Amino acid sequence: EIYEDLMRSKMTEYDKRCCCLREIQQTEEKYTDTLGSIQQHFLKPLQRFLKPQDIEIIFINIEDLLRVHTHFLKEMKEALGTPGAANLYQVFIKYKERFLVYGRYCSQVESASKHLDRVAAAREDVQMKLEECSQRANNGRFTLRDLLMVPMQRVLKYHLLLQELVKHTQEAMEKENLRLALDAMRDLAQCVNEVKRDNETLRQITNFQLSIENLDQSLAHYGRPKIDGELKITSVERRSKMDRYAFLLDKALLICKRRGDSYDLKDFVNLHSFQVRDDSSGDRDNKKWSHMFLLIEDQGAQGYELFFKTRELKKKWMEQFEMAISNIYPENATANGHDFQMFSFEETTSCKACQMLLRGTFYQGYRCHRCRASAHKECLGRVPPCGRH
Ligand SMILES: [Zn+2]
Ligand SMILES: [Zn+2]
């Protein structure tokens, strides 16, 4: 609604297509003005009244968004002015990676918002200056907390705006060219969403890190958490059921024992050399704690028996071990000479198969350690052969 209220102020295909071009322009004008409104009526006045570290946390990247969107609006207006806006698609494609600053924004939205509200709850002089700023900017129609939710909503709408314009473009050449911009804007929307998703994962990893004792390494090295919980376990050597707490991540299983407030790490299992084998024995009597599957070292060096309280739990853990092993060893990991392994990309990277961006901030995809080709899990079989021209 906030974005809809902000953007509030029988037909032929050409007439419908021209209405889409008008909406794209007018919404960008109103959007670029809103960034100017947040800067001139909230940022610059509060610079003289809050700490520069406070300024970086609440206003984040906004100053940079306004600069990117001022230039974007100009190059779009120039593209719209030319005959039949034939080169509009080029403006969207050019600004795609320039818009990746929305990654840095959307990640810290709750972080910047939460910070602002306590600041307002604590300082009495801040609370009414913000109420005065809302009046001078829009006559009390939109508050700052609501105004900071507008940039996330905007970057997520470009692909929807371009979807409609594509739907009404008659000329097949211009339609194909607009489809490329639609793909560039759908890719950007996915990156932004994957960034939000990854910070929650990293926040969850940080929490596990604190709760686990005698763990000498960062959990983040073992990928994404899959499932955690209590279970009973036996090994080739210890055939008596031991009550344990486990954390399953893509590359590891941490077998802990509750040592009061904390979980004490007892057994670290690298899933790179382990296989899961189902056991139907528990199905028959369906007695609590009888539901098992085996977790065996691929050369038979070790073999665990994992007991869950219910059949649903067993089924759920099994499915998560399969998903974890599939992530270590995806389909076609060794296709056409490669050796694709889970990789965390530090810089902006595109897939060697589809040319679309690797999404997120953490274990976004795969890297072949031999040729250094980067790729998404789905695109592995389609990457050109290892070490070629
Ligand atoms: Zn790909
Ligand atoms: Zn390779």
CATH of the domain at 203: 1.20.900.10
Q: What letter does residue 276 receive in the DSSP assignment? A: E
Lateral strand order in the sheet of 291-297: 212-213, 262-270, 252-259, 242-249, 225-234, 303-308, 291-297, 274-278
Give distance in angstroms: CA of 320 to centre of ligand 2: 28
Residue 167 phi, psi dihedral angles, 5° rounding: -55, -30
- Residues 237 and 133: their CA atoms lie apart, in Å, by 70
**Residue 352 in tokens:** 């060697």
Q: Rounded to an integer, what distance in angstroms lies between the CA atom of residue 119 and that of residue 126?
A: 7
Cα 68 to ligand 1 centroid, rounded to whole Å: 27
- Which residues on adjacent β-strands are paired with residue 295? 276, 304
Q: How far apart are CA 269 and CA 254, in angstroms?
A: 6
Measured from the alpha carbon of residue 355, the closest ligand is: 1
Q: Distance (Å, rounded) from C-alpha 154 to C-alpha 152?
A: 6
DSSP assignment string, 148-190: TSHHHHHHTTHHHHHHHHHHT--SHHHHHHHHHHHHHHHHHHH
Distance 186 CA to ligand 2 centre (A): 28
Q: Which ligand is nearest to the CA of 183?
A: 1
**What letter would DSSP give residue 61?**
T
Distance CA 329, CA 95 (A): 35
DSSP H helical ranges for 212-344: 311-328
**Cα–Cα distance for residue pair 388/148, rounded to 1 Å:** 48
Q: What count of residues does the chain have? A: 389
Q: What is the residue range of 167's domain?
A: 1-209
Ligand approaching nearest to the C-alpha of 335: 2
What is the C-alpha separation between 292 and 279, in angstroms, rounded? 6
Residues near 189 by beta carbon (within 8 Å), at least 6 away in sequence? 155, 156, 158, 159
Q: How far is the CA of 129 from the centre of ligand 1 (A)?
A: 48
Residue 96 CB contacts under 8 Å (≥ 6 apart), including other chains: 184, 185, 187, 188
Q: Which ligand is nearest to the CA of 357?
A: 1
**Residues 228, 244: Cα–Cα separation, whole Å:** 11
**Cα–Cα dist 59/116, whole Å:** 9
Calculate how far, in angstroms, residue 336's C-alpha sits from the geometric centre of ligand 2: 8
| Inter-CA distances, 176 with 77, 89, 171, 355, 381, Å | 21, 10, 9, 17, 26
> C-alpha angle with apex 67: 65 to 72, nearest 5 degrees?
90
Strand partners, 234: 305
Question: Is 255 in contact with 279 (CB distance < 8 Å)?
Answer: no
Q: What's the CA-to-centroid distance between 363 and ligand 1, angstroms?
A: 14
Amino acid at 157: K
Task: Give the Cβ contact number of residue 243 at 10 Å.
Answer: 12
Task: Show Cβ contacts of residue 227 under 8 Å, excluding neighbours closer than 6 positions.
Answer: 248, 316, 317, 320
Q: Quote the radius of gyration of the chain (alpha carbons, Å).
A: 27
Cα dist. 64→69, 78, 93, 174 in Å?
9, 22, 19, 31
**Whether the Cβ atoms of residue 137 and residue 24 lie closer than 8 Å to each other:** no
Nearest listed ligand to the Cα of residue 368: 2
- Using DSSP's 3-state secondary structure scheme, residue 143 falls into coil
CA–centroid distance, 251 to ligand 2, in Å, is: 21
Give the number of the ligand closest to the Cα of residue 190: 1
**In degrees rounded to 5, what are phi and psi of residue 338?**
-80, 175
Ligand 1 centre to CA of 250 (Å) is 20
The structure was resolved experimentally with X-ray
- For residue 387, give the ligand nearest its CA: 2
Q: Please tell me the distance between residue 378's alpha carbon and the centre of ligand 1 in angstroms.
A: 7
Find how far residue 37's CA is from the centre of its chain: 28
Residue 93 parent element (H or E)? helix 88-95
- Nearest ligand (C-alpha, residue 371): 2
CA of 345 to the centre of ligand 1 (A): 14
Q: 184 CA distance to ligand 2 centroid (A)?
A: 26
> In the structure encoding, which two tokens stand for residue 170, read together?
């008659």
d(CA 293, CA 376): 31
Bridge-partner residues for 213, per DSSP? 264
**3-state secondary structure (DSSP) of residue 319:** helix
Q: State the DSSP code for 354.
A: T
- For the chain, the distance separating the N- and C-terminal CA atoms, rounded to the nearest angstrom, is 52
Q: How many alpha carbons lie under 13 Å from residue 127 in its C-beta half-sphere? A: 7
Q: What whole-number distance in Å separates Cα of residue 191 and Cα of residue 194?
A: 5
Distance (angstroms) between ligand 1 centre and the Cα of 320 equals 24
What's the CA angle centered on 262, arms 231 and 196, to 5 degrees? 85
Resolution of this deposited model, Å: 2.5
Instruction: Give the integer Cα–Cα distance in Å for 138 and 131.
Output: 11
Ligand index nearest the alpha carbon of residue 353 = 1
For ligand 2, the distance from its centroid to the CA atom of residue 374, given in whole angstroms, is 9
Q: Are 385 and 364 in contact (CB under 8 A)?
A: no
CA of 10 to the centre of ligand 1 (A): 41
**Ligand 2: centre distance to CA 25 (Å):** 44
Pairing of strands 262-270, 212-213: parallel
